[PDB]
Amino acid sequence: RAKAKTRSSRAGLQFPVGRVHRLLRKGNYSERVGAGAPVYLAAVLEYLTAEILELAGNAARDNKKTRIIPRHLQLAIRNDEELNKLLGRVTIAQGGVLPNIQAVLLP
Amino acid sequence: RAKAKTRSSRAGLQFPVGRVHRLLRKGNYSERVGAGAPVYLAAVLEYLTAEILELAGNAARDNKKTRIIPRHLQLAIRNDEELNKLLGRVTIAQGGVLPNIQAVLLP
Amino acid sequence: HRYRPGTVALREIRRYQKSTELLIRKLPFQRLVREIAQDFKTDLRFQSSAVMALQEASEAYLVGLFEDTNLAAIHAKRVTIMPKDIQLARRIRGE
Amino acid sequence: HRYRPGTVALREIRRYQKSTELLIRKLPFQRLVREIAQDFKTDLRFQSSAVMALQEASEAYLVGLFEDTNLAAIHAKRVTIMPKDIQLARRIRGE
Amino acid sequence: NIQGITKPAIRRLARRGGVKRISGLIYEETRGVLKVFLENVIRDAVTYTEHAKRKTVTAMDVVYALKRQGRTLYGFGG
Amino acid sequence: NIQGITKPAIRRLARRGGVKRISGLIYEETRGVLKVFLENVIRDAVTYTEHAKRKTVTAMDVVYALKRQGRTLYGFGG
Amino acid sequence: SRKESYSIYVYKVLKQVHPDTGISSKAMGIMNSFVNDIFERIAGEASRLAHYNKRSTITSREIQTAVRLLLPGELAKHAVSEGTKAVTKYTSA
Amino acid sequence: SRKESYSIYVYKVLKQVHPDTGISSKAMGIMNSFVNDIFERIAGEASRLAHYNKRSTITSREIQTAVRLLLPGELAKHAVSEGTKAVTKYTSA
DNA sequence: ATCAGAATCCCGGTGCCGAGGCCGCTCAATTGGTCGTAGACAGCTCTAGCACCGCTTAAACGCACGTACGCGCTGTCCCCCGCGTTTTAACCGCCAAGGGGATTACTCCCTAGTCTCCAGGCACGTGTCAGATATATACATCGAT
DNA sequence: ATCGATGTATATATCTGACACGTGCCTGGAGACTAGGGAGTAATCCCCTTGGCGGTTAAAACGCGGGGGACAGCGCGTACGTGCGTTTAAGCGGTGCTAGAGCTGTCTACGACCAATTGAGCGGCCTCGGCACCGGGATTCTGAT
């Protein structure tokens, strides 16, 4: 037979299309799962991951750090209106809060 | 064969056990559905419906009415702390609100 | 004869809290809905029940918001609701 | 030398808003968790990570509530948070 | 068209909300808030309609939009 | 055990929340609020534990309780 | 086109609890929506429980647990009582 | 007992966007939770859409619509672009 | 307290239209039987949760004192309420048209299912370097004069 | 302004444990082929959405007078922030042991599936009684005196 070529490599993705497919079939979502659905889902997940990781790496570099920590992730998410809206009701462990003091409290 | 005896009648219920079973099997909830699950669910649904209907009928009688309307349903739900909690994020069409005026506004 | 300020307001509170009809005019609300929907998709039709559902939801939402606004005003030792009260209510609600 | 009231408070705000460590003591929090859980089921064991998750959630919740309470205080032209402020915040949140 | 939500209507809504006195800027604030709310709900309803390849927004579509935004409405088929 | 949540701890939490001045009754109010929250979460977590026929409340159980109460927590396995 | 609904059963229950009380069409629509909503909530919670415990079957235990998690206080207590009684009666034919 | 996770893929993406930047175990756990959460949200929305339209198959259209409903603004726009590009490339082998 | 006037509640009469009941039909639940498998139960392992002891030290706690802020009172003025008059457009009813939503029928291609294989991903192990800690220091900020 | 105290940032050196890489294996994903049924497409029909006309009346707009409520200023007194000395228990590190989470094997009860039957539930039609609208008297309540 032919050498095994992963669906991820066929779609130019880093996320596992086969695994996503299995999770869809066994997740009690529908009776049948189309061939394009795992590819699409994997691509979306990858894009979101890339966005967050890029912003966190930028925050780390601004903090003179070379490793991303929950603090950096929290900073990246809370400083972006859209990401904050998406992750509004989510608590990041060991993330802390954004530095914010009301103007009326300043001396 | 033997005369058809409904599962509702076997369980002493008014709600349709067979229908509940079908909705569970075709609702993409699990691979298999136990025989007791529809019975239990139907009984719970029946109890909740009975409770609400009883309270609404009481409100109707208090309003010298013989027919239940959305207003009566709203009164019944909002005047019971537990039912209000259960149906907190629910809007009853044509239900109105409870008469409530803050004490500080009174003459 | 002139009723003192507040009497008619309280009478209106009681009347509208006892009644259940929709308080926004149907035709203007419908026009608003259609104008807003125009920005998303053109040549859109609308079921009567769709418009009615929208109206019911909007009115319920606004009543709830006015309730929270009133609470904020009273908290600030005022009896008049103001934009700062609406803003506070919405901010705390997460909107 | 004595810093004027407010200076050390603002310094503490800056420090704790810049830091991320948990602010409640672990052992007392654990005891509280176990005492509360005792009323639901006896001879209950607890994973260390379970207790840590509870602590993280509780602290986040309380910080958010204090933020809303502060907003209420400023709304009432005050700089001191009070129980009435907590109550208003919680009521508006739907709790 | 937003002006069709007249001041008396907003006053009536406030009365149902238990409000006794109203500032003059409340009407404009309310109009803005209502516009935003409507925009969100209509957006989602239209998305559902387009997915169904329909040209008519249905009550069911509206209901679904409200449900997914945590504002469940009873009385219009779900 | 509720007294273990000392006044300094509540003050620290308020400081993270941006509070500059604190009334003396805040500590008791906060203790009550925390107790209620904890009770709800622990109740649900214990329900999950009992359903699993387990004798140990797990982090997963806690995560699920928070998730179903609309307080999704990241970092503890979901 | 046949459109199923819970009207008939809600009416039976109404006639049991209030023999002389009727119901409007609007209120009937409200009841139908309510029943559907509660059904979804319970079934979804049971599904999650099953998945969490790596089980493929939704049983009466899952339904009971879902009820305890969703219904507050005495609502849950009485609903559990009702469900258990019904299951027992059914199992005894 | 093997426990699957998205660590490898998250790390790969990190190495693509920031070749000299690493990641802590805690942050990796956060990312894993994030991926799982988003997965669930999208899959559930697609399932609902399918059920609403009396369809038994979850397709790329359902995924796309779910993404549009959940992701706000340009997040949605770019995610849709990515998904479409990926699907096209896959379909062209 | 009184009294007049304005608003709401209640009581009775008439009508009308929507809820309740009945009937035909049809398709979805029931019954009876078979078969695979999943989960209930027994038993064994070994992980980690609980209990304890001891030392240390950092955090909590109690108290003294000063001052900034909460709160009550007073005055002012402005702007919202309440009511009378004019205008306008919402609503109801009635009619016309057409477009699109729901239905049915035919087809075909797209996905589940099975088998065989093999490579990717995941426990285990390791080493080395980023960050935590400690110390000295520089620097900016707060406060009293 | 200004200088002094003082906390906080910043710069450098040691260590250390946690993360990034390698390895072996095994099981889940890929290649290949099959059937069958779900979804796509095309025609039809009818219902329900859109558009227009007219009247008429209820609701909205506008003007105006005034009163009461927002808001600013001021005084006071007390409660809370800051600092310091004392004490208390939290934390860390080691060690123990046993309960219970977790895995494997076996087998039996139980739920999927399938065909025939039939009766429960839905669509449609009809009618009568609950409720709504109108009108008029009774009661309540408000404000000026």
Numbering used by the authors:
A (entry chain G), B (entry chain C): 11 to 117
C (entry chain E), D (entry chain A): 39 to 133
E (entry chain F), F (entry chain B): 25 to 102
G (entry chain D), H (entry chain H): 32 to 124
What did the article's authors report about this structure?
Histones H2A, H2B, H3 and H4 are the protein components of the nucleosome, an elemental structural unit of eukaryotic chromatin. The H2A–H2B and H3–H4 heterodimers are formed by interactions between the histone-fold domains, and the histone octamer is established with two each of the H2A–H2B and H3–H4 dimers. The nucleosome core is composed of the histone octamer and approximately 150 bp of DNA, which is left-handedly wrapped around it in a symmetrical manner. In the nucleosome, the N-terminal tails of histones project out from the DNA superhelical gyres.
Since all of the Cys residues are converted into Ala residues during the desulfurization process after peptide ligation, we used the H3.2 C110A mutant, in which the Cys110 residue of H3.2 was replaced by Ala. Consistent with the structure of the all tail-less nucleosome, the overall structure of the nucleosome containing acetylated H3 was quite similar to that of the non-acetylated nucleosome.
